[PDB]
Design a protein around this ligand. Structure first.
Ligand code: ATP
Ligand code: ATP
Lengths: 76, 427, 448
């Protein structure tokens, strides 16, 4: 399911604006985490895990800029 | 009479549609006065074909009754039967038509002749009187009889009506400490609602972990009240709730629950009862209450370190943690703390909370105690909790040596008509 | 644990010298048949069997409440008396800690045991470490052992001395190698948690003497295993009740009945009475010769009856115990008075005695297969607060029954009530006391 969904974005040929939107969402999550650190351990752990996953997705987008095997090729 | 007051209150409620008119009614206040004046009491209980007992009628005193007997004389059965009766009363009080614990198949007598088991009981409230009969037939037997619960339900109704109009109404305490208090309850190696303390908590005792959080909350409230410097505590909590909401706008269910908790904290700070029985006074009373039973120690403190709280006790010149105490002081500390916790939670209106009414059943009072302690525990408990009825079973002669003649009950086995029967005799 | 060149020294009959002699002999001869018949092995066997296991003395330094103290224990029975907070349990845990390393080294060498918990060190400012030491004497052979732990935060090291236990355990493993059913010592500990051990999976088909060596304490699943072991014994008896034993049952009884009726009948070559008596004599002689092992239905029926009678010895009010096979599952039925009782319906006091005696009997039987009467095996047993859930009538006779049933087992018992103290000799009484000496409170032990 995940591979097909990822290949859908490749089929749509989304531009770099999607990476900018993801970066903005990551920055908003970081600000929320900073607010949470002030005056909920499970929430903090979940937010940190989501931030790490978003950072990994951004690094995947950078590798997409560096180019790699398409998800369509793996799917078929 | 109680029935006259109940009828008058019902008529006034029916006529007075407005809530304020019903609250201002003299009938409701008179009924509350009668309820407060009345003291909980259990006059007698009849047991028929239950376990070893075949036929028995027992009468209990108002203050304290102690049963002494050897092994196999049915001391535990009497306690189990009383807990059986009290279970239905608690269940009916807690909610409408709550089912209660029933008599198990193996509880009936093994004799071929017996066909069914029945327990009858009577409860007296000053001048009022009520009774309850619970019965279960033997397996594979017809003509099953159905238990009668009208008398108990009529007792539960007046309590629900009284507590509906007054949020500070007292309730009777019903507790039963079995042998299980010695395994890990005595050991420590493992907003609060007053409704959960009594109705939602069964008579058996298992875990005391809650006692620690309750003590932590009591200490935090006492420290906040004594140190003051809170300023607008309600406004500060509301600002914390607003900050949490802003962070949420910038796991969701947990965040919403935390925001509701912050709003509850703001409401609590805004209330600020600051009554005479403040948090600092309750904390001192609880600590001095426990220290009364342990003359060897000096003081008990709650020390905060490593982002956690630990209990520190001083004995002689050495400070000890909770886990380093012996089994003997573990048992007394657990039992007394659990006694005081329910009294505080159930009676938030009395100036001295250690004066409520109730019934307590204790089995094997002489577990892990040397004779010196065994010779003064009874008087200590009676003095500490005056308006409570106690039922205790023991076989140590040291305990018996310090009990009045009228409060004891001696069980004997006598062969009559070729069949062994149990009898109860006074000196 | 070395071969060595067998340094002569002077003539002696120490067990260690025999151990070294056997080790030196083994390094040359290869044929196991000659080894199994060597005189050195016989001497080692005799010396090991004659020796009686018993602990000798113990000392405690800076452990829990006790600051400095040394005790000497009797060889048959010793009782400690004191009130709450006098460290009656602490001594028992110290002995259990010491015995755990000996237990560990028998299953497999160089295996660790039980260490000291970090919170058990004394709480005084000037303390630095805690130590426990003990001595074991096998008639004339002496071993010692030290266990120690340094307080957290210090930067000075301490070590343990495990040469004695390793050497002693090597002898037991060596003798077990060349003997089919060599016995082992018994070690047990009945803590205060046994109250709900009896108060409260893949089917096992293989039993062994090492099954009891997994842990030194008694708790939880041990009770379950006792039930599974008991039914195994019962079926073993039933199998032997059938087969050829029934054939002799039919032949001997009928022939005897044939004689008896004739004598009773006195009806009227002298008929065939002499021939019938001769046949009865031949059958009796064959039946007597056919007996093997214990000569009373081998050793299965006698073992089952011995266990049942041992349990019934502590509960005089009961008549018999039977293992009814219910259609769904098995169940055990007692009988008190004129009533039949189930084990779940017993009182707390009878449950405690049932579990304690049954566990001891199971351990002794498992560890002593060769003995005709397994109850005579040696060992050490620790019991805490013998007066739990027992009325004073039973308190006065528990000690003598325990000693009489198992006469070769060393007992260490702590008590709380004066009823037991009425039936104990002065020789085996130690009284704990608190005395402030030199401005420092300390514990002392005084003989009566
Ligand atoms: N169904 C039954 N029919 C007949 N006798 C029973 C039955 N159930 C239990 N008993 C008897 O009850 C006796 C005592 O067991 P029980 O569980 O009542 O303890 P107890 O005497 O109340 O407890 P304690 O020793 O703590 O005072 C047993 O010896 C047993 O013979
Ligand atoms: N680290 C410690 N420092 C000082 N005293 C300690 C420490 N740990 C335990 N103690 C002492 O141990 C005492 C209890 O010891 P212990 O449990 O052996 O005695 P007991 O009451 O005779 O035993 P039991 O009731 O378990 O049979 C406590 O009174 C406590 O003062």
């Amino acid at each position: 399911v995940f591979l097909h969904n990822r290949a859908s974005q490749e089929k749509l040929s989304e531009s770099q604006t999607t990476i900018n939107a993801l970066f903005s969402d990551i920055q908003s999550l970081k600000a929320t985490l900073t607010q949470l650190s002030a005056i909920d351990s499970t929430v903090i752990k979940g937010l940190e895990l989501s931030l790490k996953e978003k950072l990994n997705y951004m690094k995947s987008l950078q590798s997409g800029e560096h180019k790699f095997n398409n998800a369509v090729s793996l799917y078929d | 009479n109680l029935e006259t007051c109940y009828v008058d209150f019902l008529e006034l409620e029916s006529h007075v549609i407005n809530e304020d008119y019903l609250k201002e009614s003299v009938e409701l206040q008179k009924l509350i006065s009668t309820l407060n004046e009345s003291k909980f009491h259990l006059n007698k209980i009849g047991i028929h074909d239950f376990k070893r007992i075949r036929e028995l009628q027992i009468s209990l005193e108002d203050d304290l009754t102690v049963f002494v007997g050897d092994n196999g004389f049915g001391k535990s059965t009497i306690l189990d039967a009383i807990a059986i009766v009290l279970s239905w009363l608690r269940s009916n009080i807690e909610k409408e038509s709550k089912p209660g614990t029933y008599i198990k198949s193996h509880e009936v007598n093994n004799s071929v002749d017996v066909e069914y088991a029945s327990i009858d009981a009577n409860i007296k409230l000053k001048d009022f009187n009520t009774s309850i009969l619970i019965t279960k037939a033997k397996e594979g037997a017809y003509y099953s009889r159905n238990n009668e619960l009208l008398g108990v339900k009529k007792l539960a109704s007046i309590y629900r009506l009284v507590n509906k109009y007054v949020d500070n109404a007292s309730l009777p305490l019903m507790a039963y400490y079995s042998i299980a208090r010695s395994y890990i309850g005595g050991g420590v190696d493992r907003v609060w609602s007053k409704f959960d303390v009594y109705d939602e908590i069964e008579f058996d005792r298992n875990d005391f972990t809650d006692f620690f959080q309750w003590l932590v909350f009591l200490h935090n409230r006492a420290s906040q009240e004594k140190l003051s410097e809170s300023q607008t505590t309600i406004n500060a909590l509301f600002s914390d709730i607003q900050s949490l909401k802003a962070t949420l706008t910038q796991v969701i269910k947990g965040l919403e629950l935390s925001l509701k908790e912050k709003l509850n904290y703001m409401k609590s700070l805004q209330s600020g009862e600051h009554k005479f029985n403040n948090a600092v006074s309750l904390y001192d009373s609880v600590i001095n209450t426990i220290l009364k039973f342990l003359p060897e120690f000096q003081w008990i403190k709650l020390v905060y370190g490593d982002d956690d709280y630990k209990i520190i006790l001083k004995k002689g010149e050495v400070e000890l943690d909770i886990q380093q105490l012996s089994q003997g002081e573990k048992t007394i500390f657990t039992l007394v703390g659990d006694l005081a916790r329910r009294l505080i939670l159930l009676n938030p209106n009395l100036s001295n909370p250690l004066l409520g009414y109730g019934i307590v059943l204790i089995d094997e009072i002489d577990l892990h105690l040397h004779p010196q302690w065994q010779q003064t525990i009874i008087e200590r408990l009676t003095s500490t909790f005056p308006n409570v009825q106690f039922v205790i079973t023991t076989h140590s002669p040291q305990v018996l040596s310090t009990v009045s003649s009228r409060s004891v009950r001696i069980l004997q086995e006598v062969e009559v008509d070729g069949v062994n029967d149990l009898i109860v005799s006074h000196p």
